[PDB]
Design an enzyme around this catalytic site. Structure first.
Site, PDB file in Angstrom:
ATOM      1  N   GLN B   2       0.824  -1.216   0.000  1.00 30.22           N
ATOM      2  CA  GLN B   2       0.000   0.000   0.000  1.00 30.22           C
ATOM      3  C   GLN B   2       0.853   1.259   0.000  1.00 30.22           C
ATOM      4  O   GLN B   2       1.970   1.286   0.527  1.00 30.22           O
ATOM      5  CB  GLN B   2      -0.854  -0.049   1.235  1.00 30.22           C
ATOM      6  CG  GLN B   2      -1.706   1.199   1.512  1.00 30.22           C
ATOM      7  CD  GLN B   2      -2.621   0.932   2.690  1.00 30.22           C
ATOM      8  OE1 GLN B   2      -3.759   0.508   2.489  1.00 30.22           O
ATOM      9  NE2 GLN B   2      -2.098   1.097   3.938  1.00 30.22           N
ATOM     10  N   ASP B  32     -22.437  11.691  -5.640  1.00 33.31           N
ATOM     11  CA  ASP B  32     -21.501  11.787  -6.770  1.00 33.31           C
ATOM     12  C   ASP B  32     -21.998  10.866  -7.900  1.00 33.31           C
ATOM     13  O   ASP B  32     -23.205  10.653  -8.037  1.00 33.31           O
ATOM     14  CB  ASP B  32     -20.081  11.388  -6.261  1.00 33.31           C
ATOM     15  CG  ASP B  32     -18.970  12.108  -7.014  1.00 33.31           C
ATOM     16  OD1 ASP B  32     -18.860  11.835  -8.250  1.00 33.31           O
ATOM     17  OD2 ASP B  32     -18.184  12.934  -6.441  1.00 33.31           O
ATOM     18  N   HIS B  64     -15.400   9.424 -11.480  1.00 33.05           N
ATOM     19  CA  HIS B  64     -15.142  10.510 -10.539  1.00 33.05           C
ATOM     20  C   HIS B  64     -15.576  10.096  -9.122  1.00 33.05           C
ATOM     21  O   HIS B  64     -14.796  10.323  -8.166  1.00 33.05           O
ATOM     22  CB  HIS B  64     -15.898  11.730 -11.017  1.00 33.05           C
ATOM     23  CG  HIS B  64     -15.780  12.938 -10.138  1.00 33.05           C
ATOM     24  ND1 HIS B  64     -16.649  13.194  -9.099  1.00 33.05           N
ATOM     25  CD2 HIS B  64     -14.971  14.025 -10.227  1.00 33.05           C
ATOM     26  CE1 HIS B  64     -16.374  14.380  -8.581  1.00 33.05           C
ATOM     27  NE2 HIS B  64     -15.342  14.892  -9.228  1.00 33.05           N
ATOM     28  N   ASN B 155     -13.980  25.103  -9.478  1.00 35.25           N
ATOM     29  CA  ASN B 155     -12.745  25.182 -10.236  1.00 35.25           C
ATOM     30  C   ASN B 155     -12.793  26.395 -11.163  1.00 35.25           C
ATOM     31  O   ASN B 155     -12.288  26.313 -12.296  1.00 35.25           O
ATOM     32  CB  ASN B 155     -12.594  23.940 -11.128  1.00 35.25           C
ATOM     33  CG  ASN B 155     -12.272  22.679 -10.321  1.00 35.25           C
ATOM     34  OD1 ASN B 155     -11.997  22.743  -9.098  1.00 35.25           O
ATOM     35  ND2 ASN B 155     -12.238  21.562 -11.008  1.00 35.25           N
ATOM     36  N   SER B 221     -12.753  18.937  -6.417  1.00 35.55           N
ATOM     37  CA  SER B 221     -13.373  17.618  -6.150  1.00 35.55           C
ATOM     38  C   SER B 221     -12.478  16.692  -5.336  1.00 35.55           C
ATOM     39  O   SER B 221     -12.969  15.821  -4.644  1.00 35.55           O
ATOM     40  CB  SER B 221     -13.597  16.858  -7.470  1.00 35.55           C
ATOM     41  OG  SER B 221     -14.805  17.290  -8.100  1.00 35.55           O
TER      42      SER B 221
END
Ligand SMILES: [Ca+2]
Ligand code: NA
Lengths: 63, 281
Positions: B2, B32, B64, B155, B221
């Site tokens: 990991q 989402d 996303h 954004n 995001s």
């Protein structure tokens, strides 16, 4: 060029044509104005927000 | 093996993990595009879809929602990435279709589902330039009901002295999150304005992607779920803290960066937030 304020009020067809002249590799996605969208930044993408008549309703910008 | 993405380290989540706190029993709704529940580095506890033509919330046709979910809660194991709150109970609340967009009513239906199902935290890595009374009512209701609500600030970058924070981030009841990079510099796309609350890592953020993949995304995001995950870490250490207290703990312990117009209160620091006594570092 990353914004196209002069395209507001034009057809979505003209907007795609103009954007692809300035940015030929653009990934253009057409969405209804007044929707909510993901907030990731994609420098290859230009979203086109259109009104119910398919005219551009918000300044197109890269992102 | 990991890997711990830099942003998880940057917000000091490993300090909470070392104390023994990983978001266990905290319910986080990722509102989402869905979450790919087959990903071996995610565990999805439940969810629901509000997208008329995509009825499965555990299928993410965009990517996303799955990336956002991994920043919140990618599992602690020997694979992939580690999430901010790797033991959190993750809910896929699908309100965006494959193309990344949803109608306001779908977003509101998802917030209502989250309230009805007793979510502790909502993350909304989404936005639009206008609000609506119904959208404001839904987020205000979630907050009144005890939910910590976190959203991407947007954004839209700068526009002179105008705010460019989008909705629902721009509502007072929602914590609006901007993006910095690994050097704590505001990302050039990060929205600005007095409604910007805190910042988190939002540049080159490695997380989970559908079909057992990983990848680096950019955006406010990506910043938002660092803060939603931090809220889950806080709640796992202080399970009686209200949403009011979680929000103040994060706001009151940021590392201050530049002017608040561009940076809000600065970079979240979940180690400091989860102490009883709070101050900025
Ligand atoms: Ca992992
Ligand atoms: Na706000």
């Amino acid at each position: 060029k990353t914004e196209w304020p002069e395209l507001v009020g034009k057809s979505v067809e003209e907007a795609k044509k103009v954007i692809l002249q300035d940015k030929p590799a653009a990934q253009i996605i057409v969405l209804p104005v007044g929707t909510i969208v993901t907030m990731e930044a994609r420098i290859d993408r230009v979203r086109l927000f259109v009104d119910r008549l398919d005219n551009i309703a918000q300044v197109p910008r890269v992102g | 093996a990991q890997s711990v993405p830099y942003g998880v380290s940057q917000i000091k989540a490993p300090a909470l993990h070392s104390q023994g706190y990983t978001g266990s029993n905290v319910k986080v709704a990722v509102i989402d595009s869905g979450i790919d529940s087959s990903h071996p580095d995610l565990k999805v506890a439940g969810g629901a879809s509000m997208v008329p033509s995509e009825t499965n919330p555990f299928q993410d046709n965009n990517s996303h929602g799955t990336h956002v979910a991994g920043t919140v809660a990618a599992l602690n194991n020997s694979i992939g990435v580690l999430g901010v709150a790797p033991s959190a109970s993750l809910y896929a609340v699908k309100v965006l279709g494959a193309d990344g967009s949803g109608q306001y009513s779908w977003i509101i239906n998802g917030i209502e589902w989250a309230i009805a199902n007793n979510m502790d935290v909502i993350n909304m890595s989404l936005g639009g330039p206008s609000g609506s009374a119904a959208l404001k009512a839904a987020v205000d209701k979630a907050v009144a009901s005890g939910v910590v609500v976190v959203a991407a600030a947007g954004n839209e970058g700068t526009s002179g002295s105008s705010s460019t924070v989008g909705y629902p981030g721009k509502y007072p009841s929602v914590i609006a999150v901007g993006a910095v990079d690994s050097s704590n510099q505001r990302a050039s796309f990060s929205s600005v304005g007095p409604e910007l609350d805190v910042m988190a890592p939002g540049v080159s953020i490695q997380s989970t992607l559908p079909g057992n993949k990983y990848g680096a995304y950019n955006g406010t995001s990506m910043a938002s779920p660092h803060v939603a995950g931090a809220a889950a870490l806080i709640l796992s250490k202080h399970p009686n803290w209200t949403n009011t207290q979680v929000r103040s703990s994060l706001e009151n312990t940021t590392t201050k960066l530049g002017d608040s117009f561009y940076y809000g209160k600065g970079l979240i620091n979940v180690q400091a937030a989860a102490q009883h006594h709070h101050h900025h570092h």
